[PDB]
Symmetry: D2
C-alpha cells in the first residue's frame, strides 16, 4: 500500500499537524472565534483553487473512470462543499462577498500555487499524491480529536468537524488511497509531492493560528 | 444577442448540418445500424475528451461561478449524455471496452485536438464559444427532426434522440448561451471559434455517414 | 548522439503511411522541378502557421521535460524554429516575391489548423517522450523525402526549389533527426505505447502535402 | 506607463528589497562568502524553473513577435546565464553538479510554484507581470548599490553584479517594460501578479541571508 508508506515517511510532519494548537483548540472548543473567522476567510481561496487543481487533474487522467473520479470531486467542491462553506459563513456572521474580498495569506498563495502548478505540468497519479494530504489529514484529525467534540460548546465548530467524521467523507478518502495504490508507481517516486503538500498543510494551520 | 449573431453567420454551415443525410436518416429510422454503431464508437471517446475540454476550461475561469458552470456543464455531460451512451452500446451489442479500443477517425482526432488545444491556451469565453456548437446544434437537430421520431421503428434510435428533446438538455444549452451573451465580448471577436466548431460538427457527421 | 530501438519500430509500423508520403506527387514534382510555382507559393504561405505553432508545441514540450538537458534540447529547437528556420523561411519567400506579412495574413487550411491543434493539444497535456513521438515525423520525414528524391535536384532548374531542399540534405539536418531518435530511443518507453502519437502526426504529414498539392 | 504604476504601488515592498542587508553587503563586499555560496546553490532551482515559466509564457503569446521574446529569454536563461552561473560557481569552488543536488528552500519552491502556476494557467501579459519583478529589481538593485563595487575587493561579487549594470541587461528590462506598457491592460488588473512576485523576491533575499 504505497499510500501507507507515503503516510509513514510523512509521520514526522503529520504528527506535528495532528498535535497543532489551532486544530486542538477547534475540536475542544477553546479556539477564539476571531482565529476561526480568519481561517474561514482563507478557506474560500483554498477551496476555489483546490477545485481548479482537481479539474486540471481530471483533464488528463489515464482512464475515463479516473477522470469521472476527479471531475465529480471537482464538481463536489464548488457546489457540495461550497454550500456547506456558505452556511458556516452565515452562522458566524460573514458572507461569500467578505470571503471573496478576503486576502489570501502567504502559505495560502504558495500552497495553491504549488497544487495548480503540479496538476498542470506533472503526471496524473503524481498530482493525486499531491492532493492526498488535504483529504486524508483532515480525516485523521477528526479521528484523533473527534472525541473532544462532545464537550465542545461552540455549535459552529461542531458543525465544521462533522463533515470529516462522516462516512461519506471517509469513504472519499478510501477511494483516493485506492487510486494511488492501484496505479503501479513506486512510493519513492511519489513522496516529493505528498511531502510538500503535507508540509504546506502544516504551514497552513500555523498561519490561521497566528492570524498571519 | 451575441450568441444569436454567431448562429446567424453560421447558418450556412448549420443549415448543411441540419439537412445532413446521417441526421435525417437517424431521426426518420432509415439509418443503417452499421453506420449508427460506427458513430457510437467514435462518440464515447469524443465525449471523453469533451469532458476533459470542459475541465481545462473550468480550471481557468475568471470567476468562481463560471468555474461552477463549466464544471456542471462538464459533469452534466458525464451524467446526462455519457450514461445514455453506455446504455446505447449494450442495446446495440457493443461494450465500453469495444468503444475504448475503437480507433478515432481523422475528423474525430482533429476536432477533439482542436477543442483541447483551444481550452488549454485561449481565453475562457473563447473556449466556451468553441464548445457551444456541440451542445446547441444537437438541440436544434432534435428540434427539426424531432417529429419524425413517431414513425421511427428503431428503439435504439428513439432512445438516442430523447436526450436532445429533453428540457434538461435544452436547459443545459441555455446556460452556455447566457455565459457567452453576458460575457462582454463581440460576436466578431468570438466567431472564428464558433465557426471552426460548427465546421467540425458538419465534418464529423459526414465522417460518420461514410464509415471513415 | 545516435539511434537504435523504438524509433525504428515506429517507422516500420508507419511504413504504409510513410511510403504514401515519400511517393507523393507534390514532393516528387518539387525535387524534380516540375511542381507549378503557384503550388509551391501556396505551400510556403501555409508554412507560416505550421512553423509558428510547431514552435509553441516545442515550448509546451520543454515546460515539462523529465530532465534539464532534455529541457535545454526542447527549448533550443523552439528558439531555432523562430530564429534560424524563420530566417530561411523569410529568405525563401523573398525569392518567390512574397513577404512575411503575406504569410502572416495567409489563411491556414483545415489540415494545417487540425494538425497544429493536434501537436499543441498533445504537447500541452501528454508526456514528454509522447510529445516527441508526435513531433518526430515532421523532422524525420523531410530528411527521408530528401534522401529519396535528392538525386533529382541535379537536373532541377528551379533555384528556389533547390534552395528549399538543401536544408534537408545537409549533414546538420540529418544529425538533428538522429539526436531526436536518440532521445526517444533512450526513453525506455515501448513502441506500442508511443505509436498513436507517431501515427497521427505521420497521417497529418501525408494530408498536409496533399492539401498543398490540391490548393486547399 | 502601466509598469510605472505597478512600480509605485509596489514601492513599499521594493524599497525593503533595495535596502536589504544581503544585497547591501554583497555589492559592498561585506557579505560572508558562505551566504553567497548558499545563494548561488539556491539559484539553480530559480534559474531552471524560471526557464520553464518563460516557456509556458511563450506557448501562449498573443503575437508571434511576443512568442520570440519569451523563447529567446527562456533559451537565454538555459544557455548564456547558465554558462555565467557555472563560471560563477567555479570561482567559488562549487560545480553545477553541486547546484543541481542543492535542496531548494521553501521560498524558492513556493516562488517557482507561483510563476509556473501563473504561467501555465493565466494570460500572457499577466505572466509577464509575474516575471517582470525578477528582471527589473536586479537592475534597480545594481543601480542603487553599483557605486559600492569600486571599493568591493571580492572579484566573484563584482563579476556577479556586472551583468545587472551592463547596458545589455538594462535594455532587456526596457523591452520587457515596453511589452507591458503597450499591452493595453490596466495596472490595477495587472498588479496582483507584479505584487506577489515582488513579495517572493523579498522573501528570496531574506532566505539566502538566513541560510534557511
Amino acid at each position: 500500500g504505497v499510500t501507507g508508506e507515503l503516510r509513514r515517511r510523512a509521520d514526522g510532519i503529520w504528527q506535528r499537524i495532528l498535535a497543532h494548537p489551532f486544530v486542538a483548540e477547534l475540536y475542544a472548543g477553546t479556539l477564539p472565534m476571531e482565529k476561526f473567522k480568519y481561517y474561514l476567510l482563507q478557506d474560500y481561496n483554498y477551496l476555489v483553487n483546490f477545485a481548479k487543481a482537481l479539474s486540471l487533474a481530471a483533464s488528463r487522467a489515464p482512464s475515463v473512470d479516473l477522470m469521472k473520479t476527479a471531475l465529480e470531486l471537482a464538481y463536489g467542491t464548488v457546489t457540495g462543499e461550497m454550500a456547506n462553506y456558505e452556511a458556516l459563513l452565515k452562522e458566524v456572521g460573514l458572507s461569500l462577498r467578505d470571503a471573496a474580498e478576503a486576502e489570501p495569506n502567504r502559505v495560502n498563495v504558495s500552497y495553491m500555487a504549488y497544487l495548480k502548478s503540479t496538476c498542470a505540468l506533472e503526471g496524473f497519479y503524481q498530482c493525486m499524491a499531491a492532493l492526498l494530504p488535504c483529504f486524508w489529514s483532515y480525516a485523521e484529525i477528526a479521528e484523533r480529536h473527534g472525541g473532544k467534540l462532545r464537550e465542545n460548546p461552540v455549535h459552529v465548530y461542531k458543525k465544521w468537524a462533522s463533515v470529516y467524521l462522516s462516512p461519506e467523507y471517509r469513504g472519499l478518502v478510501e477511494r483516493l488511497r485506492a487510486v494511488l495504490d492501484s496505479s503501479g508507481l513506486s512510493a519513492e517516486e511519489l513522496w516529493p509531492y505528498f511531502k510538500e503538500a503535507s508540509l504546506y498543510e502544516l504551514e497552513f494551520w500555523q498561519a490561521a493560528y497566528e492570524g498571519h
